[PDB]
């Protein structure tokens, strides 16, 4: 990756 | 079912949503703990039952708040209804969030009126096509106290599962349906709420807000439990109880 394209939690229960 | 006595104004007046006309999404309810903390949403399907997401972890210690809860006149006509029994779908997968649905049987029937009524359930064979403009509602986060901001509504399109997989890949199961990625998004606090689409004039529950972008990005589609795939289980449960 490279920039803010790496969300860690990219997914989560809503 | 699926017809508000007080018509919603779809242009508006969830991230990037708008305030609903007060009382215009009857079936929308707020699930709160005893302390009064709203933690998920749900939809009334008749006067005695609420349908919500399994991952929400609802118990009989929680209460269902129906009415003009926090929405435009705010603290308005509302009914706090306690829960008598919780029916989690045994096929719920706590890891993939597949089959995200739970039924709540109230101990006390909700009193229906202009501002409280039921959403329509689809038949299992119903076809809700990709591209269809549907609406999702809730008090959930407006950006990833959250006293709910005021009830919001957002118009968004359904996606096909293959188009949804371009973003989410293998996390997408048959029992899920995605919508959005169009400038709006459901978000934390909106789970268990409804994704409704109009079929012949009746708003019908096509999805149950389930999961999505941790960020509630408005260009990533949300994922909802596909009610068409779970409705047979819903019918059996109601007939049995």
PDB file of C-alpha atoms in Angstrom:
ATOM      1  CA  UNK A   1       0.000   0.000   0.000  1.00  0.00           C
ATOM      2  CA  UNK A   2       1.064   3.627   0.535  1.00  0.00           C
ATOM      3  CA  UNK A   3      -0.717   6.702   2.003  1.00  0.00           C
ATOM      4  CA  UNK A   4      -3.911   6.444   4.036  1.00  0.00           C
ATOM      5  CA  UNK A   5      -5.195   3.496   1.962  1.00  0.00           C
ATOM      6  CA  UNK A   6      -4.398   1.265   4.824  1.00  0.00           C
ATOM      7  CA  UNK A   7      -7.157   1.541   7.313  1.00  0.00           C
ATOM      8  CA  UNK A   8      -6.602  -0.929  10.203  1.00  0.00           C
ATOM      9  CA  UNK A   9      -9.854  -1.805  10.922  1.00  0.00           C
ATOM     10  CA  UNK A  10     -10.771  -1.494   7.432  1.00  0.00           C
ATOM     11  CA  UNK A  11     -14.162  -3.049   8.170  1.00  0.00           C
ATOM     12  CA  UNK A  12     -16.441  -3.081  11.174  1.00  0.00           C
ATOM     13  CA  UNK A  13     -19.898  -4.061  12.328  1.00  0.00           C
ATOM     14  CA  UNK A  14     -22.220  -1.221  12.123  1.00  0.00           C
TER      15      UNK A  14
ATOM     16  CA  UNK B   1     -47.202  -2.359   6.203  1.00  0.00           C
ATOM     17  CA  UNK B   2     -44.616  -0.179   4.438  1.00  0.00           C
ATOM     18  CA  UNK B   3     -46.802   2.907   4.122  1.00  0.00           C
ATOM     19  CA  UNK B   4     -46.149   5.887   6.489  1.00  0.00           C
ATOM     20  CA  UNK B   5     -49.248   7.889   7.365  1.00  0.00           C
ATOM     21  CA  UNK B   6     -46.764  10.783   7.329  1.00  0.00           C
ATOM     22  CA  UNK B   7     -45.015  10.589   3.931  1.00  0.00           C
ATOM     23  CA  UNK B   8     -41.254  10.841   3.897  1.00  0.00           C
ATOM     24  CA  UNK B   9     -39.844  13.555   1.684  1.00  0.00           C
ATOM     25  CA  UNK B  10     -37.014  11.647  -0.079  1.00  0.00           C
ATOM     26  CA  UNK B  11     -34.984  14.598  -1.126  1.00  0.00           C
ATOM     27  CA  UNK B  12     -34.629  14.946   2.622  1.00  0.00           C
ATOM     28  CA  UNK B  13     -35.083  18.331   4.281  1.00  0.00           C
ATOM     29  CA  UNK B  14     -25.604   7.731   8.687  1.00  0.00           C
ATOM     30  CA  UNK B  15     -22.912   9.804   6.936  1.00  0.00           C
ATOM     31  CA  UNK B  16     -24.016  12.456   4.416  1.00  0.00           C
ATOM     32  CA  UNK B  17     -27.619  11.906   5.135  1.00  0.00           C
ATOM     33  CA  UNK B  18     -30.502  14.258   5.958  1.00  0.00           C
ATOM     34  CA  UNK B  19     -33.063  14.610   8.784  1.00  0.00           C
ATOM     35  CA  UNK B  20     -36.187  12.714   8.109  1.00  0.00           C
ATOM     36  CA  UNK B  21     -39.529  14.439   8.296  1.00  0.00           C
ATOM     37  CA  UNK B  22     -40.540  13.597  11.910  1.00  0.00           C
ATOM     38  CA  UNK B  23     -42.670  10.415  12.087  1.00  0.00           C
ATOM     39  CA  UNK B  24     -42.091   9.510   8.425  1.00  0.00           C
ATOM     40  CA  UNK B  25     -40.212   6.099   9.047  1.00  0.00           C
ATOM     41  CA  UNK B  26     -42.747   4.470  11.504  1.00  0.00           C
ATOM     42  CA  UNK B  27     -41.145   1.189  11.840  1.00  0.00           C
ATOM     43  CA  UNK B  28     -37.765   2.536  12.700  1.00  0.00           C
ATOM     44  CA  UNK B  29     -36.953   1.880  16.342  1.00  0.00           C
ATOM     45  CA  UNK B  30     -34.046   2.595  18.679  1.00  0.00           C
ATOM     46  CA  UNK B  31     -32.663  -0.245  20.774  1.00  0.00           C
ATOM     47  CA  UNK B  32     -31.319   1.213  24.089  1.00  0.00           C
ATOM     48  CA  UNK B  33     -29.871  -0.332  27.211  1.00  0.00           C
ATOM     49  CA  UNK B  34     -31.529   0.390  30.549  1.00  0.00           C
ATOM     50  CA  UNK B  35     -29.331   3.401  31.142  1.00  0.00           C
ATOM     51  CA  UNK B  36     -30.943   4.738  28.001  1.00  0.00           C
ATOM     52  CA  UNK B  37     -27.963   4.386  25.667  1.00  0.00           C
ATOM     53  CA  UNK B  38     -29.047   3.891  22.044  1.00  0.00           C
ATOM     54  CA  UNK B  39     -26.787   1.140  20.632  1.00  0.00           C
ATOM     55  CA  UNK B  40     -28.532  -0.247  17.508  1.00  0.00           C
ATOM     56  CA  UNK B  41     -31.714   0.274  15.484  1.00  0.00           C
ATOM     57  CA  UNK B  42     -34.445  -2.123  14.417  1.00  0.00           C
ATOM     58  CA  UNK B  43     -37.709  -2.301  12.478  1.00  0.00           C
ATOM     59  CA  UNK B  44     -41.192  -3.127  13.731  1.00  0.00           C
ATOM     60  CA  UNK B  45     -42.678  -5.871  11.489  1.00  0.00           C
ATOM     61  CA  UNK B  46     -46.063  -6.040  13.343  1.00  0.00           C
ATOM     62  CA  UNK B  47     -47.224  -4.788  16.711  1.00  0.00           C
ATOM     63  CA  UNK B  48     -45.451  -7.483  18.688  1.00  0.00           C
ATOM     64  CA  UNK B  49     -42.184  -7.997  16.875  1.00  0.00           C
ATOM     65  CA  UNK B  50     -39.010  -6.148  15.945  1.00  0.00           C
ATOM     66  CA  UNK B  51     -36.437  -7.286  13.550  1.00  0.00           C
ATOM     67  CA  UNK B  52     -32.785  -6.321  14.090  1.00  0.00           C
ATOM     68  CA  UNK B  53     -29.226  -7.560  13.534  1.00  0.00           C
ATOM     69  CA  UNK B  54     -27.828 -10.540  15.418  1.00  0.00           C
ATOM     70  CA  UNK B  55     -24.447  -8.890  16.070  1.00  0.00           C
ATOM     71  CA  UNK B  56     -26.164  -6.206  18.107  1.00  0.00           C
ATOM     72  CA  UNK B  57     -26.346  -8.578  21.112  1.00  0.00           C
ATOM     73  CA  UNK B  58     -29.803  -7.521  22.257  1.00  0.00           C
ATOM     74  CA  UNK B  59     -31.149  -9.096  25.460  1.00  0.00           C
ATOM     75  CA  UNK B  60     -34.276  -8.820  27.495  1.00  0.00           C
ATOM     76  CA  UNK B  61     -32.486  -6.141  29.591  1.00  0.00           C
ATOM     77  CA  UNK B  62     -32.703  -3.814  26.614  1.00  0.00           C
ATOM     78  CA  UNK B  63     -35.725  -1.800  25.582  1.00  0.00           C
ATOM     79  CA  UNK B  64     -37.286  -0.855  22.256  1.00  0.00           C
ATOM     80  CA  UNK B  65     -38.139   2.757  21.803  1.00  0.00           C
ATOM     81  CA  UNK B  66     -40.733   3.349  19.043  1.00  0.00           C
ATOM     82  CA  UNK B  67     -42.100   6.717  17.870  1.00  0.00           C
ATOM     83  CA  UNK B  68     -40.772  10.249  17.326  1.00  0.00           C
ATOM     84  CA  UNK B  69     -37.689   9.556  19.084  1.00  0.00           C
ATOM     85  CA  UNK B  70     -35.085  12.234  18.730  1.00  0.00           C
ATOM     86  CA  UNK B  71     -36.343  13.392  15.297  1.00  0.00           C
ATOM     87  CA  UNK B  72     -37.579  16.898  14.562  1.00  0.00           C
ATOM     88  CA  UNK B  73     -39.851  17.705  17.417  1.00  0.00           C
ATOM     89  CA  UNK B  74     -37.505  15.314  19.327  1.00  0.00           C
ATOM     90  CA  UNK B  75     -38.623  13.912  22.700  1.00  0.00           C
ATOM     91  CA  UNK B  76     -42.042  13.427  21.195  1.00  0.00           C
ATOM     92  CA  UNK B  77     -44.637  10.709  20.900  1.00  0.00           C
ATOM     93  CA  UNK B  78     -42.634   7.610  22.018  1.00  0.00           C
ATOM     94  CA  UNK B  79     -43.199   4.191  23.594  1.00  0.00           C
ATOM     95  CA  UNK B  80     -40.568   2.411  25.547  1.00  0.00           C
ATOM     96  CA  UNK B  81     -41.344  -1.259  25.106  1.00  0.00           C
ATOM     97  CA  UNK B  82     -39.606  -3.906  27.032  1.00  0.00           C
ATOM     98  CA  UNK B  83     -38.478  -7.172  25.373  1.00  0.00           C
ATOM     99  CA  UNK B  84     -39.852 -10.524  26.352  1.00  0.00           C
ATOM    100  CA  UNK B  85     -37.785 -12.926  24.277  1.00  0.00           C
ATOM    101  CA  UNK B  86     -34.913 -12.725  21.827  1.00  0.00           C
ATOM    102  CA  UNK B  87     -34.668 -15.109  18.861  1.00  0.00           C
ATOM    103  CA  UNK B  88     -31.197 -15.099  17.282  1.00  0.00           C
ATOM    104  CA  UNK B  89     -30.943 -16.890  13.915  1.00  0.00           C
ATOM    105  CA  UNK B  90     -28.872 -20.050  14.681  1.00  0.00           C
ATOM    106  CA  UNK B  91     -27.107 -19.638  11.365  1.00  0.00           C
ATOM    107  CA  UNK B  92     -25.521 -16.365  12.611  1.00  0.00           C
ATOM    108  CA  UNK B  93     -21.769 -16.397  12.017  1.00  0.00           C
ATOM    109  CA  UNK B  94     -20.048 -14.233  14.585  1.00  0.00           C
ATOM    110  CA  UNK B  95     -16.927 -13.992  12.495  1.00  0.00           C
ATOM    111  CA  UNK B  96     -18.119 -13.135   8.951  1.00  0.00           C
ATOM    112  CA  UNK B  97     -21.310 -11.517  10.261  1.00  0.00           C
ATOM    113  CA  UNK B  98     -23.338 -13.689   7.837  1.00  0.00           C
ATOM    114  CA  UNK B  99     -27.059 -14.269   8.571  1.00  0.00           C
ATOM    115  CA  UNK B 100     -27.099 -11.111  10.745  1.00  0.00           C
ATOM    116  CA  UNK B 101     -30.690 -11.143  12.016  1.00  0.00           C
ATOM    117  CA  UNK B 102     -32.505 -11.463  15.269  1.00  0.00           C
ATOM    118  CA  UNK B 103     -36.166 -11.158  16.107  1.00  0.00           C
ATOM    119  CA  UNK B 104     -37.403  -9.428  19.251  1.00  0.00           C
ATOM    120  CA  UNK B 105     -40.808 -10.340  20.698  1.00  0.00           C
ATOM    121  CA  UNK B 106     -42.099  -7.493  22.837  1.00  0.00           C
ATOM    122  CA  UNK B 107     -43.750  -8.153  26.208  1.00  0.00           C
ATOM    123  CA  UNK B 108     -46.177  -5.339  25.510  1.00  0.00           C
ATOM    124  CA  UNK B 109     -47.579  -4.642  22.035  1.00  0.00           C
ATOM    125  CA  UNK B 110     -46.627  -1.315  20.443  1.00  0.00           C
ATOM    126  CA  UNK B 111     -49.593   1.063  19.985  1.00  0.00           C
ATOM    127  CA  UNK B 112     -49.824   1.845  16.274  1.00  0.00           C
ATOM    128  CA  UNK B 113     -50.717   5.333  15.122  1.00  0.00           C
ATOM    129  CA  UNK B 114     -49.703   7.913  12.597  1.00  0.00           C
ATOM    130  CA  UNK B 115     -46.169   7.669  13.945  1.00  0.00           C
ATOM    131  CA  UNK B 116     -45.846   3.971  14.703  1.00  0.00           C
ATOM    132  CA  UNK B 117     -46.432   1.219  12.185  1.00  0.00           C
ATOM    133  CA  UNK B 118     -44.818  -1.786  10.447  1.00  0.00           C
ATOM    134  CA  UNK B 119     -42.399  -2.234   7.576  1.00  0.00           C
ATOM    135  CA  UNK B 120     -43.300  -4.836   4.946  1.00  0.00           C
ATOM    136  CA  UNK B 121     -41.359  -8.048   4.718  1.00  0.00           C
ATOM    137  CA  UNK B 122     -40.451  -9.391   1.286  1.00  0.00           C
ATOM    138  CA  UNK B 123     -41.131 -12.843   0.045  1.00  0.00           C
ATOM    139  CA  UNK B 124     -38.040 -15.073  -0.378  1.00  0.00           C
ATOM    140  CA  UNK B 125     -38.526 -15.149  -4.136  1.00  0.00           C
ATOM    141  CA  UNK B 126     -38.730 -11.385  -4.459  1.00  0.00           C
ATOM    142  CA  UNK B 127     -36.223  -9.767  -6.791  1.00  0.00           C
ATOM    143  CA  UNK B 128     -34.708  -6.402  -5.683  1.00  0.00           C
ATOM    144  CA  UNK B 129     -32.421  -5.420  -8.521  1.00  0.00           C
ATOM    145  CA  UNK B 130     -29.047  -3.823  -8.604  1.00  0.00           C
ATOM    146  CA  UNK B 131     -29.402  -0.132  -9.301  1.00  0.00           C
ATOM    147  CA  UNK B 132     -32.651   0.274  -7.372  1.00  0.00           C
ATOM    148  CA  UNK B 133     -32.855   3.405  -5.285  1.00  0.00           C
ATOM    149  CA  UNK B 134     -33.637   2.373  -1.684  1.00  0.00           C
ATOM    150  CA  UNK B 135     -33.539   4.241   1.606  1.00  0.00           C
ATOM    151  CA  UNK B 136     -31.702   3.559   4.872  1.00  0.00           C
ATOM    152  CA  UNK B 137     -32.430   5.231   8.216  1.00  0.00           C
ATOM    153  CA  UNK B 138     -31.027   5.502  11.706  1.00  0.00           C
ATOM    154  CA  UNK B 139     -29.516   7.530  14.464  1.00  0.00           C
ATOM    155  CA  UNK B 140     -26.092   6.072  14.001  1.00  0.00           C
ATOM    156  CA  UNK B 141     -22.785   7.894  13.845  1.00  0.00           C
ATOM    157  CA  UNK B 142     -22.625  10.853  11.468  1.00  0.00           C
ATOM    158  CA  UNK B 143     -18.829  10.559  11.250  1.00  0.00           C
ATOM    159  CA  UNK B 144     -16.731   7.469  12.269  1.00  0.00           C
ATOM    160  CA  UNK B 145     -21.740  11.814  23.047  1.00  0.00           C
ATOM    161  CA  UNK B 146     -23.291  10.309  19.953  1.00  0.00           C
ATOM    162  CA  UNK B 147     -26.632  11.162  21.559  1.00  0.00           C
ATOM    163  CA  UNK B 148     -28.031  10.245  18.282  1.00  0.00           C
ATOM    164  CA  UNK B 149     -27.917  13.111  16.156  1.00  0.00           C
ATOM    165  CA  UNK B 150     -31.581  13.465  14.916  1.00  0.00           C
ATOM    166  CA  UNK B 151     -32.958  10.586  12.860  1.00  0.00           C
ATOM    167  CA  UNK B 152     -31.326  10.587   9.469  1.00  0.00           C
ATOM    168  CA  UNK B 153     -32.283   9.165   6.097  1.00  0.00           C
ATOM    169  CA  UNK B 154     -30.238   8.547   2.986  1.00  0.00           C
ATOM    170  CA  UNK B 155     -31.112   7.444  -0.529  1.00  0.00           C
ATOM    171  CA  UNK B 156     -28.694   4.920  -2.023  1.00  0.00           C
ATOM    172  CA  UNK B 157     -28.582   2.274  -4.676  1.00  0.00           C
ATOM    173  CA  UNK B 158     -28.411  -1.487  -4.334  1.00  0.00           C
ATOM    174  CA  UNK B 159     -25.383  -3.121  -5.821  1.00  0.00           C
ATOM    175  CA  UNK B 160     -25.080  -6.500  -7.432  1.00  0.00           C
ATOM    176  CA  UNK B 161     -23.032  -9.005  -5.338  1.00  0.00           C
ATOM    177  CA  UNK B 162     -20.383  -9.165  -8.039  1.00  0.00           C
ATOM    178  CA  UNK B 163     -20.033  -5.393  -8.052  1.00  0.00           C
ATOM    179  CA  UNK B 164     -19.973  -5.446  -4.275  1.00  0.00           C
ATOM    180  CA  UNK B 165     -17.145  -8.038  -4.349  1.00  0.00           C
ATOM    181  CA  UNK B 166     -14.925  -5.620  -6.340  1.00  0.00           C
ATOM    182  CA  UNK B 167     -14.625  -3.724  -3.077  1.00  0.00           C
ATOM    183  CA  UNK B 168     -15.096  -6.415  -0.469  1.00  0.00           C
ATOM    184  CA  UNK B 169     -14.077  -9.664  -2.070  1.00  0.00           C
ATOM    185  CA  UNK B 170     -14.736 -12.890  -0.163  1.00  0.00           C
ATOM    186  CA  UNK B 171     -16.296 -11.272   2.881  1.00  0.00           C
ATOM    187  CA  UNK B 172     -19.477 -10.997   0.801  1.00  0.00           C
ATOM    188  CA  UNK B 173     -21.833 -13.983   1.316  1.00  0.00           C
ATOM    189  CA  UNK B 174     -25.141 -14.897  -0.342  1.00  0.00           C
ATOM    190  CA  UNK B 175     -27.132 -13.742   2.661  1.00  0.00           C
ATOM    191  CA  UNK B 176     -25.652 -10.215   2.376  1.00  0.00           C
ATOM    192  CA  UNK B 177     -26.688  -7.368   0.110  1.00  0.00           C
ATOM    193  CA  UNK B 178     -24.705  -4.198  -0.358  1.00  0.00           C
ATOM    194  CA  UNK B 179     -25.879  -0.686  -1.054  1.00  0.00           C
ATOM    195  CA  UNK B 180     -24.301   2.727  -1.285  1.00  0.00           C
ATOM    196  CA  UNK B 181     -20.812   3.853  -2.230  1.00  0.00           C
ATOM    197  CA  UNK B 182     -22.672   6.733  -3.774  1.00  0.00           C
ATOM    198  CA  UNK B 183     -21.939   9.734  -1.587  1.00  0.00           C
ATOM    199  CA  UNK B 184     -23.693   8.351   1.524  1.00  0.00           C
ATOM    200  CA  UNK B 185     -23.183   5.532   4.087  1.00  0.00           C
ATOM    201  CA  UNK B 186     -24.697   3.691   7.053  1.00  0.00           C
ATOM    202  CA  UNK B 187     -22.447   3.752  10.112  1.00  0.00           C
ATOM    203  CA  UNK B 188     -21.838   2.499  13.654  1.00  0.00           C
ATOM    204  CA  UNK B 189     -25.048   2.848  15.642  1.00  0.00           C
ATOM    205  CA  UNK B 190     -27.167   2.223  12.574  1.00  0.00           C
ATOM    206  CA  UNK B 191     -26.774  -1.663  12.732  1.00  0.00           C
ATOM    207  CA  UNK B 192     -30.037  -3.549  12.996  1.00  0.00           C
ATOM    208  CA  UNK B 193     -31.816  -0.683  11.232  1.00  0.00           C
ATOM    209  CA  UNK B 194     -33.583  -0.971   7.890  1.00  0.00           C
ATOM    210  CA  UNK B 195     -32.650  -0.673   4.256  1.00  0.00           C
ATOM    211  CA  UNK B 196     -35.996  -0.232   2.559  1.00  0.00           C
ATOM    212  CA  UNK B 197     -37.025  -0.341  -1.100  1.00  0.00           C
ATOM    213  CA  UNK B 198     -40.465   0.447  -2.554  1.00  0.00           C
ATOM    214  CA  UNK B 199     -42.245  -2.385  -4.250  1.00  0.00           C
ATOM    215  CA  UNK B 200     -45.590  -1.256  -5.732  1.00  0.00           C
ATOM    216  CA  UNK B 201     -45.771   1.656  -3.378  1.00  0.00           C
ATOM    217  CA  UNK B 202     -44.878  -0.247  -0.174  1.00  0.00           C
ATOM    218  CA  UNK B 203     -41.588   0.241   1.600  1.00  0.00           C
ATOM    219  CA  UNK B 204     -40.169  -3.253   2.020  1.00  0.00           C
ATOM    220  CA  UNK B 205     -37.261  -4.403   4.156  1.00  0.00           C
ATOM    221  CA  UNK B 206     -34.643  -5.588   1.698  1.00  0.00           C
ATOM    222  CA  UNK B 207     -31.827  -5.293   4.148  1.00  0.00           C
ATOM    223  CA  UNK B 208     -30.782  -4.951   7.781  1.00  0.00           C
ATOM    224  CA  UNK B 209     -27.833  -2.653   8.394  1.00  0.00           C
ATOM    225  CA  UNK B 210     -24.923  -5.035   9.221  1.00  0.00           C
ATOM    226  CA  UNK B 211     -21.372  -3.891   8.576  1.00  0.00           C
ATOM    227  CA  UNK B 212     -19.041  -1.957   6.392  1.00  0.00           C
ATOM    228  CA  UNK B 213     -16.157   0.460   6.146  1.00  0.00           C
ATOM    229  CA  UNK B 214     -14.662   1.150   9.618  1.00  0.00           C
ATOM    230  CA  UNK B 215     -14.547   4.666   8.319  1.00  0.00           C
ATOM    231  CA  UNK B 216     -18.102   4.804   6.972  1.00  0.00           C
ATOM    232  CA  UNK B 217     -16.619   5.978   3.674  1.00  0.00           C
ATOM    233  CA  UNK B 218     -19.172   7.364   1.290  1.00  0.00           C
ATOM    234  CA  UNK B 219     -17.446   5.816  -1.698  1.00  0.00           C
ATOM    235  CA  UNK B 220     -17.323   2.217  -0.280  1.00  0.00           C
ATOM    236  CA  UNK B 221     -20.600   0.276  -0.223  1.00  0.00           C
ATOM    237  CA  UNK B 222     -22.277  -0.757   2.992  1.00  0.00           C
ATOM    238  CA  UNK B 223     -23.225  -4.300   3.710  1.00  0.00           C
ATOM    239  CA  UNK B 224     -26.732  -5.292   4.870  1.00  0.00           C
ATOM    240  CA  UNK B 225     -28.241  -8.652   5.803  1.00  0.00           C
ATOM    241  CA  UNK B 226     -30.212  -9.836   2.756  1.00  0.00           C
ATOM    242  CA  UNK B 227     -33.724 -10.248   4.132  1.00  0.00           C
ATOM    243  CA  UNK B 228     -34.934 -12.294   1.125  1.00  0.00           C
ATOM    244  CA  UNK B 229     -32.507 -14.982   2.282  1.00  0.00           C
ATOM    245  CA  UNK B 230     -33.604 -14.840   5.877  1.00  0.00           C
ATOM    246  CA  UNK B 231     -37.317 -14.214   5.655  1.00  0.00           C
ATOM    247  CA  UNK B 232     -38.397 -17.851   5.645  1.00  0.00           C
ATOM    248  CA  UNK B 233     -36.681 -18.222   8.998  1.00  0.00           C
ATOM    249  CA  UNK B 234     -38.538 -15.055  10.142  1.00  0.00           C
ATOM    250  CA  UNK B 235     -41.938 -16.509   9.114  1.00  0.00           C
ATOM    251  CA  UNK B 236     -41.265 -19.793  10.875  1.00  0.00           C
ATOM    252  CA  UNK B 237     -40.291 -18.011  13.995  1.00  0.00           C
ATOM    253  CA  UNK B 238     -43.396 -15.926  14.043  1.00  0.00           C
ATOM    254  CA  UNK B 239     -45.664 -18.872  13.311  1.00  0.00           C
ATOM    255  CA  UNK B 240     -44.001 -20.791  16.152  1.00  0.00           C
ATOM    256  CA  UNK B 241     -44.381 -18.087  18.714  1.00  0.00           C
TER     257      UNK B 241
END
